Amino acid sequence: DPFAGDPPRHPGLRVNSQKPFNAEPPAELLAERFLTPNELFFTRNHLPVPAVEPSSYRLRVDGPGGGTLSLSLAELRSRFPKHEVTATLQCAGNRRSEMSRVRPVKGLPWDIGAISTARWGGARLRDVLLHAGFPEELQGEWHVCFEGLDADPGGAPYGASIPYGRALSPAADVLLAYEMNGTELPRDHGFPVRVVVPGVVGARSVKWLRRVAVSPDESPSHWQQNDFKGFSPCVDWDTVDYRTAPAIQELPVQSAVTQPRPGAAVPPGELTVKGYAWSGGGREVVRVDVSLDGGRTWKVARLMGDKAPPGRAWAWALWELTVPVEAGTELEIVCKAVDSSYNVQPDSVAPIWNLRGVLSTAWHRVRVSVQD
Amino acid sequence: DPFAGDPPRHPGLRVNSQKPFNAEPPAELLAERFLTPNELFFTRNHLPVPAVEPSSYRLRVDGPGGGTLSLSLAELRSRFPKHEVTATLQCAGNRRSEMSRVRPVKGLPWDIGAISTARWGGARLRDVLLHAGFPEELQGEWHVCFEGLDADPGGAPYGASIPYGRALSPAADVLLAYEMNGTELPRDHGFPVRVVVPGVVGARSVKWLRRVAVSPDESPSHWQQNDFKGFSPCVDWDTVDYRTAPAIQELPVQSAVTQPRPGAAVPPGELTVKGYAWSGGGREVVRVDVSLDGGRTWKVARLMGDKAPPGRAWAWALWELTVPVEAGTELEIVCKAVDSSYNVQPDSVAPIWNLRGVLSTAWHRVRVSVQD
Ligand SMILES: Nc1nc2c(c(=O)[nH]1)N[C@H]1C(S)=C(S)[C@@H](COP(=O)(O)O)O[C@H]1N2
Ligand SMILES: Nc1nc2c(c(=O)[nH]1)N[C@H]1C(S)=C(S)[C@@H](COP(=O)(O)O)O[C@H]1N2
Ligand SMILES: [Mo]
Ligand SMILES: [Mo]
């Protein structure tokens, strides 16, 4: 069994695939803490988890002229000043199951928890690339390609890329992380080194980093070219042309209700409704509207968190709103967020439906009853 | 009459206010050309149009230490290399009248034409500020405040501000424009000098520029502090607190159908449906979906224009889609756009309604009939 050497996990997760392991935290715990504990942070593995001996590990970094820099773990820790960045990672497939309610799609059936937040510690990718000898600025459109140590039976590594400009920007905070919430990177989350690309879809944060290369083109890997793209609702498996749509990088504004859960019976008097909101590209969440009546009327929620600098809101905003609730009534609790560019979430899922089930950002709706 | 010295205008505009002058081009002409002719470009004036003698004109630029640089028109033309930027300006109030259909709002009743596109020529604001002696980077959050020559009866100039970072960024393309579509700036559009802030709401592109100042704070002017902000649908005139929401800078993804027009009877066979789409923040439009049946099914439109570099799509994308149409049928033509961060437009207007009528980006719907 290629998966026999996989790490053990916390017993209470919502697992949607054992092999490869793909799991999200229970929704009742997801927004309990601003920083998701390591043991609960959602896990998305395409492949078996690599088993890495720390001391023999080398990160290969290809330089401008085609020479190869080779960095040990200890050298990554000591050569470059450690930077810490608190960033939310969200999988493209988050809330996919709601898309499937409209018309079935292919993909891991994620509920609202394919998103988590951690403080990440590591080398700035910018610094590593300058050390390899690259300039601030290359002419034209360049990309930094990443390969992980995990590979399919045919030998193709997990791979992704980001634009060179984002890799080199001080403000974009792209990390080669070896620390997660103050402890060393767990195996499931990329031990010993992962890329963390703040404000950008989870897919680009390559775990178990083996190689960093600079190229005139995007990553040639199947996951960069033939996956993680959004399409019209009209597109099906027979008509899909992956060249017609851009690789997802930044994600659009997103939110969900974590408390209370669908089907609940809640006591009369006061109900505290909680959830999360987040947007891609470092765009702050500026407002979260909450409705108890299926989105006819709304009240403004309270946003928690400490504000980040402009253009650098990498971390989700947790929200809450305490409302009065009348004995023996039905509620449809809906939330929607607004980011600093004043993007908004769409009303319904059908018009954003796509064959891959990605980019599921329509209002989250939770139906509950009030007890008597 | 304070408006007697105002310029004459093209006879065929859709004027919503004579004094001060506020007008949009007819929708049938709006998307006819990629670059909106100067005579048709939408005009938004809060005040009488300033009468400016070109030679005695001086732009005041305050330097780092509180000294004042003073620049003539000729010096602005000769001192700094002319840069050309093609950018769409969209008023916050675009498509306000559709918001009013839900619940009446205060404001100029714009239809879909409070948006236009031009190639702008001028000094990079970045270069002017470096010449005044400012550094690449100031510590903390700084703003560049602009004042126009137009003032109210009490003497307060039109004013706005943008973040310092955007003013200094080579890639953000902020201009002090003295040329518009290859000719000198018309009076209505800011003669002799206006700021052009690409990817950002029209309000910040100060016309008739008199002063540029660098400040630790946003512009203190009423239009920066107590206007151009988005609010929840629940907020009314008695509850509004302008400190709770950020000044609009970047605008969200937007589109409209320009052809055919509401109420039309069209011939059977083939119908070419045309419109525009655009997004704030230099985010490209990557797809436009069009529906003939009120948004139940959709087809992908054709996007026209030449692609801009990543993060710099300042100009709208014009779109078209030719469809078959059956004799004696009713159509509800709807469009929606998707930007490069995969933001989308919301289904309906009520949930985005606000008391100022700004930020009106729900699907544009056009009802027509087919002849027999
Ligand atoms: N090497 C490698 N990196 C990877 C993946 C993978 O399968 N292999 N999955 C990607 C995807 S699709 C997501 S959403 C994130 C999930 O990161 P997490 O497991 O730490 O939450 O990792 C990304 N990085
Ligand atoms: N000096 C000055 N600048 C101004 C205005 C104004 O009233 N005075 N209107 C602003 C607003 S709200 C908009 S939408 C744009 C409109 O620019 P246009 O008239 O060239 O289309 O100008 C902006 N710049
Ligand atoms: Mo993912
Ligand atoms: Mo405006």
Please tell me about this protein's structure.
The first copy, chain A, has about 375 residues and is mainly beta. Chain A has two domains: about 1-250, Oxidoreductase, molybdopterin-binding domain (Sulfite Oxidase, Chain A, domain 2), CATH 3.90.420.10; about 250-370, Sandwich (Immunoglobulin-like), CATH 2.60.40.650. Chain A contains six helices and 22 strands. In chain A, the strands form five sheets. In chain A, strands 5-4-13-8-9 form a five-stranded mixed beta sheet. In chain A, strands 6, 7, 10, 11 and 12 form a five-stranded antiparallel beta sheet that branches. A five-stranded mixed beta sheet of chain A has the order 15-22-21-17-18, with no helix packed on it. Chain A is globular. The termini of chain A are far apart. In chain A, about 50% of the residues are buried.
Brief write-up:
It is classed as oxidoreductase. With 372 residues, chain A is mainly β. Helix content of chain A is 9%, strand content 34%.
